[PDB]
PDB file of all heavy atoms in Angstrom:
ATOM      1  N   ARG A 139     -34.744  23.353  -2.447  1.00 73.47           N
ATOM      2  CA  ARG A 139     -33.714  24.362  -2.651  1.00 73.47           C
ATOM      3  C   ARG A 139     -32.498  23.773  -3.370  1.00 73.47           C
ATOM      4  O   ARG A 139     -31.946  24.400  -4.283  1.00 73.47           O
ATOM      5  CB  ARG A 139     -33.314  24.979  -1.308  1.00 73.47           C
ATOM      6  CG  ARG A 139     -33.698  26.458  -1.132  1.00 73.47           C
ATOM      7  CD  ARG A 139     -32.800  27.117  -0.080  1.00 73.47           C
ATOM      8  NE  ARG A 139     -33.212  28.456   0.339  1.00 73.47           N
ATOM      9  CZ  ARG A 139     -34.277  28.739   1.083  1.00 73.47           C
ATOM     10  NH1 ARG A 139     -35.211  27.806   1.279  1.00 73.47           N
ATOM     11  NH2 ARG A 139     -34.431  29.933   1.642  1.00 73.47           N
ATOM     12  N   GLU A 140     -32.076  22.561  -2.982  1.00 74.89           N
ATOM     13  CA  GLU A 140     -30.951  21.906  -3.647  1.00 74.89           C
ATOM     14  C   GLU A 140     -31.241  21.648  -5.127  1.00 74.89           C
ATOM     15  O   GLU A 140     -30.368  21.862  -5.983  1.00 74.89           O
ATOM     16  CB  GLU A 140     -30.610  20.597  -2.931  1.00 74.89           C
ATOM     17  CG  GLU A 140     -30.175  20.774  -1.461  1.00 74.89           C
ATOM     18  CD  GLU A 140     -29.841  19.456  -0.769  1.00 74.89           C
ATOM     19  OE1 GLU A 140     -30.642  18.504  -0.880  1.00 74.89           O
ATOM     20  OE2 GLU A 140     -28.779  19.365  -0.113  1.00 74.89           O
ATOM     21  N   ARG A 141     -32.465  21.202  -5.445  1.00 77.37           N
ATOM     22  CA  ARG A 141     -32.835  20.851  -6.816  1.00 77.37           C
ATOM     23  C   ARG A 141     -32.507  21.965  -7.797  1.00 77.37           C
ATOM     24  O   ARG A 141     -32.116  21.702  -8.942  1.00 77.37           O
ATOM     25  CB  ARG A 141     -34.337  20.524  -6.899  1.00 77.37           C
ATOM     26  CG  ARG A 141     -34.750  19.180  -6.299  1.00 77.37           C
ATOM     27  CD  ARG A 141     -36.180  18.792  -6.711  1.00 77.37           C
ATOM     28  NE  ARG A 141     -36.238  18.254  -8.066  1.00 77.37           N
ATOM     29  CZ  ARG A 141     -35.982  16.990  -8.377  1.00 77.37           C
ATOM     30  NH1 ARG A 141     -35.634  16.105  -7.456  1.00 77.37           N
ATOM     31  NH2 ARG A 141     -36.065  16.605  -9.643  1.00 77.37           N
ATOM     32  N   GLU A 142     -32.676  23.216  -7.381  1.00 78.41           N
ATOM     33  CA  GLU A 142     -32.431  24.334  -8.281  1.00 78.41           C
ATOM     34  C   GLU A 142     -30.975  24.789  -8.282  1.00 78.41           C
ATOM     35  O   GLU A 142     -30.610  25.652  -9.088  1.00 78.41           O
ATOM     36  CB  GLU A 142     -33.368  25.497  -7.934  1.00 78.41           C
ATOM     37  CG  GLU A 142     -34.065  26.064  -9.181  1.00 78.41           C
ATOM     38  CD  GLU A 142     -35.149  27.098  -8.875  1.00 78.41           C
ATOM     39  OE1 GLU A 142     -34.821  28.298  -8.739  1.00 78.41           O
ATOM     40  OE2 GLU A 142     -36.332  26.706  -8.782  1.00 78.41           O
ATOM     41  N   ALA A 143     -30.140  24.223  -7.416  1.00 79.82           N
ATOM     42  CA  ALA A 143     -28.711  24.493  -7.434  1.00 79.82           C
ATOM     43  C   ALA A 143     -27.913  23.404  -8.140  1.00 79.82           C
ATOM     44  O   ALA A 143     -26.702  23.567  -8.329  1.00 79.82           O
ATOM     45  CB  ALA A 143     -28.195  24.667  -6.004  1.00 79.82           C
ATOM     46  N   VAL A 144     -28.563  22.311  -8.541  1.00 77.53           N
ATOM     47  CA  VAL A 144     -27.876  21.225  -9.223  1.00 77.53           C
ATOM     48  C   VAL A 144     -27.384  21.717 -10.579  1.00 77.53           C
ATOM     49  O   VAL A 144     -28.059  22.509 -11.253  1.00 77.53           O
ATOM     50  CB  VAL A 144     -28.821  20.016  -9.361  1.00 77.53           C
ATOM     51  CG1 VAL A 144     -28.211  18.951 -10.253  1.00 77.53           C
ATOM     52  CG2 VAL A 144     -29.156  19.448  -7.976  1.00 77.53           C
ATOM     53  N   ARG A 145     -26.181  21.280 -10.966  1.00 77.25           N
ATOM     54  CA  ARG A 145     -25.546  21.605 -12.238  1.00 77.25           C
ATOM     55  C   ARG A 145     -25.291  20.330 -13.026  1.00 77.25           C
ATOM     56  O   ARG A 145     -24.834  19.336 -12.448  1.00 77.25           O
ATOM     57  CB  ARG A 145     -24.188  22.315 -12.041  1.00 77.25           C
ATOM     58  CG  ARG A 145     -24.188  23.410 -11.016  1.00 77.25           C
ATOM     59  CD  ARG A 145     -25.203  24.442 -11.407  1.00 77.25           C
ATOM     60  NE  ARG A 145     -24.997  25.698 -10.699  1.00 77.25           N
ATOM     61  CZ  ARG A 145     -25.446  26.866 -11.136  1.00 77.25           C
ATOM     62  NH1 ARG A 145     -26.087  26.971 -12.294  1.00 77.25           N
ATOM     63  NH2 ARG A 145     -25.248  27.955 -10.398  1.00 77.25           N
ATOM     64  N   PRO A 146     -25.521  20.331 -14.333  1.00 78.63           N
ATOM     65  CA  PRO A 146     -25.094  19.191 -15.145  1.00 78.63           C
ATOM     66  C   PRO A 146     -23.590  19.221 -15.351  1.00 78.63           C
ATOM     67  O   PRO A 146     -22.980  20.286 -15.481  1.00 78.63           O
ATOM     68  CB  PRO A 146     -25.834  19.398 -16.466  1.00 78.63           C
ATOM     69  CG  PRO A 146     -25.991  20.867 -16.546  1.00 78.63           C
ATOM     70  CD  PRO A 146     -26.180  21.368 -15.142  1.00 78.63           C
ATOM     71  N   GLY A 147     -22.995  18.036 -15.385  1.00 79.00           N
ATOM     72  CA  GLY A 147     -21.573  17.914 -15.590  1.00 79.00           C
ATOM     73  C   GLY A 147     -21.282  16.658 -16.377  1.00 79.00           C
ATOM     74  O   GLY A 147     -22.187  15.925 -16.781  1.00 79.00           O
ATOM     75  N   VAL A 148     -19.995  16.406 -16.585  1.00 77.97           N
ATOM     76  CA  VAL A 148     -19.563  15.192 -17.261  1.00 77.97           C
ATOM     77  C   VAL A 148     -18.364  14.631 -16.510  1.00 77.97           C
ATOM     78  O   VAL A 148     -17.434  15.367 -16.172  1.00 77.97           O
ATOM     79  CB  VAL A 148     -19.231  15.452 -18.745  1.00 77.97           C
ATOM     80  CG1 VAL A 148     -18.347  16.687 -18.885  1.00 77.97           C
ATOM     81  CG2 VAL A 148     -18.565  14.231 -19.371  1.00 77.97           C
TER      82      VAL A 148
END
Side-chain angles (χ1 to χ4, degrees):
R139 247 203 190 71
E140 298 180 312
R141 286 193 79 83
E142 228 172 86
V144 171
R145 315 302 197 158
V148 47

